Design an enzyme around this catalytic site. Sequence first.
Site, PDB file in Angstrom:
ATOM      1  CG  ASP A  97      -2.025   0.913   1.220  1.00 49.30           C
ATOM      2  OD1 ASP A  97      -2.335   1.700   0.386  1.00 49.30           O
ATOM      3  OD2 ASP A  97      -2.716   0.839   2.271  1.00 49.30           O
ATOM      4  CB  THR A  98       1.812   3.695  -2.553  1.00 49.12           C
ATOM      5  OG1 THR A  98       0.605   3.819  -3.274  1.00 49.12           O
ATOM      6  CG2 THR A  98       2.791   2.771  -3.300  1.00 49.12           C
ATOM      7  N   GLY A  99      -0.501   4.134  -0.122  1.00 51.59           N
ATOM      8  CA  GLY A  99      -1.193   5.196   0.570  1.00 51.59           C
ATOM      9  C   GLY A  99      -1.182   5.029   2.054  1.00 51.59           C
TER      10      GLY A  99
END
Lengths: 99, 99
Positions: B25-27
Amino acid sequence: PQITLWQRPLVTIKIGGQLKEALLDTGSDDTVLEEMSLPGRWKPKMIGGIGGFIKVRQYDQILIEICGHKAIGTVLVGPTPVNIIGRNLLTQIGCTLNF
Amino acid sequence: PQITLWQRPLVTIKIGGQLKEALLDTGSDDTVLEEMSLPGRWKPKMIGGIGGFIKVRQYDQILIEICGHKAIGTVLVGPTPVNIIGRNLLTQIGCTLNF
Ligand SMILES: CC(=O)N[C@@H](CC1CCCCC1)[C@@H](O)C[C@H](C(=O)N[C@@H](CCC(N)=O)C(=O)N[C@@H](CCCNC(=N)N)C(N)=O)C(C)C
């Protein structure tokens, strides 16, 4: 552009004539924007995330410009804390994860 | 690997002598895993997301093997729907975003 993850991967979007910033998110299936001035029709929907569920409005066939790149797709508008660009548009701009 | 985003970017992790699967997850700024058998000392913490906030236990200096790569860091254990690898470990394994 090659983006490193030392800072939040934020990008500028143009949607509906308005400029905004948004987070590039691989962990989100969808694109969810903070409440805004959008036109046309919409369907009510519910999505889930980390602290639970929020109620959104689903708008189809919305043009969005991401980092100067056009994409057309479904955008959910509702009470997210941050604008999120998810997998539905990330695929459109050919965005990849590389380690 | 080069990971495309047509499907959820899932990877296999090894943590606490246990095999699990998690999302890249880049967020997410942090790494959050479902409730597990984790040895040591922890501290309570609050994190928030799309639907709200959650109560989690913070574990520091945890070794994780992420898709073969070892990393050491802060791991949060709590009520997440899915196991998530966020930015603090993502940078450790040299993961980038590319479009
Ligand atoms: C669609 C969605 O919901 N998909 C989640 C991932 C997951 C949720 C559960 C279902 C499977 C998919 C995220 O992909 C969204 C991301 C998110 O929820 N990310 C968190 C959580 C983990 C963590 N703790 O890092 C985050 O980064 N939380 C920070 C606050 C940043 C906000 N910024 C301000 N300071 N204003 C915090 N400290 O809690 C966005 C909304 C920013």
